[PDB]
Design a protein around this ligand. Sequence first.
Ligand SMILES: Cn1cc(-c2cnc3c(-c4csc(C(=O)N[C@H]5CCCC[C@H]5N)c4)cnn3c2)cn1
Length: 305
Amino acid sequence: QPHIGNYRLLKTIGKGNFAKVKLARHILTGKEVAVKIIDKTQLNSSSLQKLFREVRIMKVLNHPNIVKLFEVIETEKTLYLVMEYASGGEVFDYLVAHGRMKEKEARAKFRQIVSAVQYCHQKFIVHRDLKAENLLLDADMNIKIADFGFSFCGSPPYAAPELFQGKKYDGPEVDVWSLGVILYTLVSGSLPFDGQNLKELRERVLRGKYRIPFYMSTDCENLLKKFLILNPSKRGTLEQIMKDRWMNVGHEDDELKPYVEPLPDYKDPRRTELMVSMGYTREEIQDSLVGQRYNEVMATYLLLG
Ligand SMILES: Cn1cc(-c2cnc3c(-c4csc(C(=O)N[C@H]5CCCC[C@H]5N)c4)cnn3c2)cn1
């Protein structure tokens, strides 16, 4: 029945140059899941570093709006990251279909995005490469941030000004800039900076002047100004941005705060027993959850949600 572990591969839903993503079915539960398959035999050093960083990141993130990791399968030649499947697909697709989002809907999505990126930042993680393909949707139209493994058509229009001026290109401030671009695209359905070429693009970014769409609220535009600051050391933190008026319109008793991760349940008597009857030991279930092993036992545990 299965192609790898407990998974019947179904359909390629994404191709990168060094990685394929497949839609697949867990067999014991029959849930749909995303499998990232990386051929390590093709990868050079920087690629390999990038990959092991990805695995590190994925094992740690536990957010409603970032794709969740279920299992890692390692062989010498090939690595598999089994993660959550977002059936809504790319937010890019959605924009092309229905045009720009009304500020109400953009806000709902953007509160999610900001929550997720600031969560990462809390854990001293910066994505450094937020572009359109990183924003996916679940079936209820929730945001799902995807891919921390960098896998040049998408990149440039989301690049912070530092890139083009030789300055260091690390730090949460990079992501803050990208969030501005993303915001602009949600409400306008287009990019703040584009060019017919790389120099055009670079001049427009270094200038940092986007053009204001006539239909756009002044509240939105004050939000934009908080993200798209040229000087990296003068850009706000997402924690500060969270307090923003536009961020909170319609949540007047529900301001946006940093995500508080809920305490772990590695001892669900319900699921545990169902796995003892399914052929696992209790010491092995607990040891896998607490050792946070992301093994076959852990995958089954989480997938019974
Ligand atoms: C209807 N519909 C649903 C989907 C769709 C596409 N991709 C995904 C993923 C995903 C997890 S890691 C990853 C990735 O790293 N991709 C990389 C490899 C593939 C190329 C892009 C890269 N960012 C993608 C999860 N759910 N999901 C759903 C698409 N259409």
